[PDB]
Short mmCIF file of C-alpha atoms in Angstrom, two decimals:
data_model
loop_
_atom_site.label_atom_id
_atom_site.label_comp_id
_atom_site.label_asym_id
_atom_site.label_seq_id
_atom_site.Cartn_x
_atom_site.Cartn_y
_atom_site.Cartn_z
CA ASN A 1 -0.62 17.57 -0.46
CA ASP A 2 2.31 15.14 -0.39
CA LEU A 3 0.70 13.48 2.66
CA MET A 4 -2.63 13.00 0.86
CA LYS A 5 -0.83 11.86 -2.31
CA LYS A 6 1.07 9.34 -0.17
CA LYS A 7 -2.14 8.24 1.56
CA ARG A 8 -3.84 7.79 -1.82
CA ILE A 9 -0.82 5.71 -2.87
CA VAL A 10 -1.03 3.70 0.37
CA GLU A 11 -4.76 2.96 0.09
CA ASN A 12 -4.51 2.11 -3.63
CA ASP A 13 -1.44 -0.19 -3.42
CA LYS A 14 -2.70 -1.70 -0.13
CA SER A 15 -6.05 -2.48 -1.81
CA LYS A 16 -4.59 -4.02 -4.98
CA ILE A 17 -1.76 -5.91 -3.24
CA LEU A 18 -3.94 -7.33 -0.43
CA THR A 19 -6.67 -8.32 -2.91
CA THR A 20 -3.93 -10.04 -4.93
CA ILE A 21 -2.87 -11.86 -1.71
CA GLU A 22 -6.34 -13.29 -1.00
CA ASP A 23 -7.10 -13.94 -4.71
CA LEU A 24 -3.95 -15.98 -5.22
CA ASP A 25 -4.53 -17.60 -1.81
CA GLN A 26 -7.80 -19.06 -3.09
CA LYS A 27 -6.09 -19.78 -6.44
CA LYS A 28 -3.51 -21.80 -4.48
CA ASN A 29 -6.41 -23.47 -2.64
CA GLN A 30 -8.24 -24.61 -5.80
CA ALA A 31 -4.95 -25.71 -7.41
CA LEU A 32 -4.24 -27.76 -4.27
CA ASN A 33 -7.78 -29.21 -4.36
CA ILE A 34 -7.65 -30.26 -8.03
CA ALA A 35 -4.10 -31.65 -7.66
CA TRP A 36 -5.03 -33.49 -4.45
CA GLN A 37 -8.19 -35.00 -5.95
CA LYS A 38 -6.31 -36.02 -9.12
CA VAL A 39 -3.57 -37.70 -7.05
CA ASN A 40 -6.27 -39.25 -4.82
CA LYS A 41 -8.19 -40.84 -7.70
CA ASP A 42 -4.95 -41.91 -9.41
CA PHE A 43 -3.56 -43.48 -6.21
CA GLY A 44 -6.88 -45.23 -5.59
CA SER A 45 -6.88 -46.63 -9.13
CA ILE A 46 -3.21 -47.62 -8.73
CA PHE A 47 -3.82 -49.45 -5.44
CA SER A 48 -6.99 -51.15 -6.71
CA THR A 49 -5.09 -52.40 -9.77
CA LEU A 50 -2.10 -53.53 -7.66
#
């Protein structure tokens, strides 16, 4: 019973923690994309003005 309680704990925490890992991985990806595109358009405007 302790083994199955542990295994339930392992599958539950593994599921929520790994899904948090990929979810914040894509969150990091879209934050990088919006920051990169903002810096790209700003640097392009800066260089075209200079």
